[PDB]
Amino acid sequence: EFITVARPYAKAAFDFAVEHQSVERWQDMLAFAAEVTKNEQMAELLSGALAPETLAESFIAVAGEQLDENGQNLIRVMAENGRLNALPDVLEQFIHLRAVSEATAEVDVISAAALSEQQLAKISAAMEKRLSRKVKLNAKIDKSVMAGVIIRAGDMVIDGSVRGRLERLADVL
Amino acid sequence: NSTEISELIKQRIAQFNVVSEAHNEGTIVSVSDGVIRIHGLADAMQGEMISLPGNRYAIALNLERDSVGAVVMGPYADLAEGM
Amino acid sequence: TGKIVQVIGAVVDVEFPQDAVPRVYDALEVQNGNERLVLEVQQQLGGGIVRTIAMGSSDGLRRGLDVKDLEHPIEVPVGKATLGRIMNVLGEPVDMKGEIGEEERWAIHRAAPSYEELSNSQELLETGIKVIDLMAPFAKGGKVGLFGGAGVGKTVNMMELIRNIAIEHSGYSVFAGVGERTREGNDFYHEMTDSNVIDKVSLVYGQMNEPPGNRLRVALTGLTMAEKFRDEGRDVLLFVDNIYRYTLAGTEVSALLGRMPSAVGYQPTLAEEMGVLQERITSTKTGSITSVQAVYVPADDLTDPSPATTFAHLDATVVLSRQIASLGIYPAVDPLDSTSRQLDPLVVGQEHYDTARGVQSILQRYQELKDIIAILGMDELSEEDKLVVARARKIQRFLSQPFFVAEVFTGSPGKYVSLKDTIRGFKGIMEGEYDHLPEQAFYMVGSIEEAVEKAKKL
Amino acid sequence: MATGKIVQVIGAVVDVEFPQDAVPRVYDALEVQNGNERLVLEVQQQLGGGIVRTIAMGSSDGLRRGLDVKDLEHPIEVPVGKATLGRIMNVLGEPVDMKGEIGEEERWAIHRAAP
Numbered sequence A: 001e002f003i004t005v006a007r008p009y010a011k012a013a014f015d016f017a018v019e020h021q022s023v024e025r026w027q028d029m030l031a032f033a034a035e036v037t038k039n040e041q042m043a044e045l046l047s048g049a050l051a052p053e054t055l056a057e058s059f060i061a062v063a064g065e066q067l068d069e070n071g072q073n074l075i076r077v078m079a080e081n082g083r084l085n086a087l088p089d090v091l092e093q094f095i096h097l098r099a100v101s102e103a104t105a106e107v108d109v110i111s112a113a114a115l116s117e118q119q120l121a122k123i124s125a126a127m128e129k130r131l132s133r134k135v136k137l138n139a140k141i142d143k144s145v146m147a148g149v150i151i152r153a154g155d156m157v158i159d160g161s162v163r164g165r166l167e168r169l170a171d172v173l
Numbered sequence B: 001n002s003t004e005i006s007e008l009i010k011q012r013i014a015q016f017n018v019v020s021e022a023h024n025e026g027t028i029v030s031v032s033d034g035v036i037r038i039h040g041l042a043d044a045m046q047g048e049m050i051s052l053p054g055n056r057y058a059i060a061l062n063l064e065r066d067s068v069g070a071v072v073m074g075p076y077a078d079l080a081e082g083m
Numbered sequence C: 001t002g003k004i005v006q007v008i009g010a011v012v013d014v015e016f017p018q019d020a021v022p023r024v025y026d027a028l029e030v031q032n033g034n035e036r037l038v039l040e041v042q043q044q045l046g047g048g049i050v051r052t053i054a055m056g057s058s059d060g061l062r063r064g065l066d067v068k069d070l071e072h073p074i075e076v077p078v079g080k081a082t083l084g085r086i087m088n089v090l091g092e093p094v095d096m097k098g099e100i101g102e103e104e105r106w107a108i109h110r111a112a113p114s115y116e117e118l119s120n121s122q123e124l125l126e127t128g129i130k131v132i133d134l135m136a137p138f139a140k141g142g143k144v145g146l147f148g149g150a151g152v153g154k155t156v157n158m159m160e161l162i163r164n165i166a167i168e169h170s171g172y173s174v175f176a177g178v179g180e181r182t183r184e185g186n187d188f189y190h191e192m193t194d195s196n197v198i199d200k201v202s203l204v205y206g207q208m209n210e211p212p213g214n215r216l217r218v219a220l221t222g223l224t225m226a227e228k229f230r231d232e233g234r235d236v237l238l239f240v241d242n243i244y245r246y247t248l249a250g251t252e253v254s255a256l257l258g259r260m261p262s263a264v265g266y267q268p269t270l271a272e273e274m275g276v277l278q279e280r281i282t283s284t285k286t287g288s289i290t291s292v293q294a295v296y297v298p299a300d301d302l303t304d305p306s307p308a309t310t311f312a313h314l315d316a317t318v319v320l321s322r323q324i325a326s327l328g329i330y331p332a333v334d335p336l337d338s339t340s341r342q343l344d345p346l347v348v349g350q351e352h353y354d355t356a357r358g359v360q361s362i363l364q365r366y367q368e369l370k371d372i373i374a375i376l377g378m379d380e381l382s383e384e385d386k387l388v389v390a391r392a393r394k395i396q397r398f399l400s401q402p403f404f405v406a407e408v409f410t411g412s413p414g415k416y417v418s419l420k421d422t423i424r425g426f427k428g429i430m431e432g433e434y435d436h437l438p439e440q441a442f443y444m445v446g447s448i449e450e451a452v453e454k455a456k457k458l
Numbered sequence D: 001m002a003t004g005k006i007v008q009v010i011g012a013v014v015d016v017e018f019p020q021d022a023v024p025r026v027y028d029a030l031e032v033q034n035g036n037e038r039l040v041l042e043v044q045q046q047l048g049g050g051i052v053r054t055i056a057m058g059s060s061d062g063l064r065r066g067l068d069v070k071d072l073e074h075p076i077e078v079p080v081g082k083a084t085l086g087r088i089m090n091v092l093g094e095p096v097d098m099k100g101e102i103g104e105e106e107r108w109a110i111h112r113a114a115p
């Protein structure tokens, strides 16, 4: 999967966007580049063995919403190594590295029923002290947990669902 | 803003005339030792006879995700990339 | 729901929606021209791709075909409805007769019985065959393996064992053809129907014309029928026509499955793939399976991984030698390599045990002398060494025997020899009672009395 | 006009990239300036992307990346007939004796089909 080969390109682009104080734009540019990568006609062209420069300049043709000086270059560097399919993963790591740089975390909360604002306050205020980051909650309450709540941040998970207790108890068999 | 860029992309690719090969048709990507690699042939099937330029065939041995691997039923040396 | 995305020989990759990905060993189904093709799931790759082996010819498959997900494994008919019939790996009827009157179908992938379930037994099972039950006798409920190279006699030996055992035994039997000759499947079926014994026998055939997925899983179809008859509480005979083909069909697919090669290019999983098959062929406190397996030995190399792994699995092992068979001594059993768990004084008793170890000691000493004899000739031997040779050569001839199934080759009529007559004959030869007879007197005679009558006419 | 450029040199194996519509066929002969001599390359494989892979018919030392390559469109061609008698040649059909040029009337390609 392109996750390892996306890493170098993702970091380069972010540091550059920082030194040029233009991070928001880039994220828009990478999103556009990741959508042209999905187009069904372009997906045949990207799979066939065109020469890198004949492919890149054909790729640059289908984007005019790109910062040519900095954004055509990125495309040309990836084309010279055949990497353009990694663009949708380069995007996700750019977003990830940005959130680490902005010291900010997304957090997912799951429960049998919708929470009160006072509970959402205590959850967020706890997690910011757990993480030492800002947090932004989202709530994705569920049909199958019948009581309690789950909290997921990054890949660390805290479970208080009764579902989890019923199985965690049956485990003592 | 996503569906309108998704249809702008469809407009732009049309403007620049970038388009697929026809089904049942493809191009030779590489040539070595009588093994042939073909891109396209989205309707080729395992063990089919693929007609080459001239009056000769290759036999499709592998349907890879991006290509067909085939062996030439004759002299191979006049074949070239992009036929 | 699924789409085909690659076809490489016998292997087909299928993409599914990520909420719906088939389990391992699920059956899939796809329309291939004017017929229906089943695929068996081997591996889950990433991204909803799943990698599968075709139970049939994969030619004419396109990319982009729609694939249907069956929610269950390959399941085959079992029970008495299978008796007297020829079946496909998929459990389809292969005789021209109607549908199989199944009441139940069982998945071919099963777990072996637990260690608590196993049962021991020491009931010696007699055979007609002088060398086998002398040198490597075996029990009811045990496993026997016939090891040999190409053309040495594995099938003729198994056909005498079928004749001798499976007609004085009263219960049901299963014969699994695994990667062997289609002619010999047809020949065997007709002699069963002509003898009206067919109605006790289930036949699964996946012969050597079949593509690798058939040859690999037909063994498991064969066991799953035998496990139904065992769990019903019966005593069952299982015959497997060549176990080596199961491993070889694994080798053929393993590289396409993307597994690094091992050893002499075998699959890395060779010992597990063999072990999980072999452990199911066991007698149990509920009921018994007696098993005979032929084991092809590639390039006559008994140290190749596939023979070598098979030797630990079995209770009696009979090794057939090309060097003996080219003498025209048949059965071409090597008595210095054939062995059994049952050759033990407690179960056989002492007279049998002493006779077998005497024969083994004389024939070993004859191997030690042959390198002297080869250069110098025999005259240089000591007068006791000449007596060892003069006895050993008689013993090698008396191990020969006319088989009833071999009459179409030898012409001379088949013989059945009792265990009492075999130990009496070899014990008499080693005591030297018969040192006045020529070597030809012993060749191809049923019993020691028949040798003395042959000697009168030389 | 030379149309290729050298893109790798790994011992005797030399890789050359050509324009996509010009890629030499297999067994053809290329030539390059190895400083002060022309060096012939024989094509062994057409790789993807206009790259071809070739064996040097001489010493590989002193080749740079980016040297221009002339695509002679035939195979290796050698002089033939009476003019060859009593002469020593190398594989390229160049005289290895000192005895001047060979008065060739034809040159034939070395790779041809059997009767």
Ligand SMILES: Nc1ncnc2c1ncn2[C@@H]1O[C@H](COP(=O)(O)OP(=O)(O)OP(=O)(O)O)[C@@H](O)[C@H]1O
Residues within 6 Å of the ligand: C149, C150, C151, C152, C153, C154, C155, C156, C157, C296, C330, C331, C401, C403, C406, C409, C410
């Ligand atoms: N007891 C015997 N008497 C006479 N001939 C025999 C005997 N055993 C084997 N042979 C001869 O050996 C030949 C091959 O034996 P058989 O067919 O059993 O080998 P096989 O097991 O089929 O070997 P493979 O499976 O590798 O082909 C036959 O011609 C058979 O006549």
Ligand SMILES: [Mg+2]
Residues within 6 Å of the ligand: C154, C155, C180
């Ligand atoms: Mg056989």
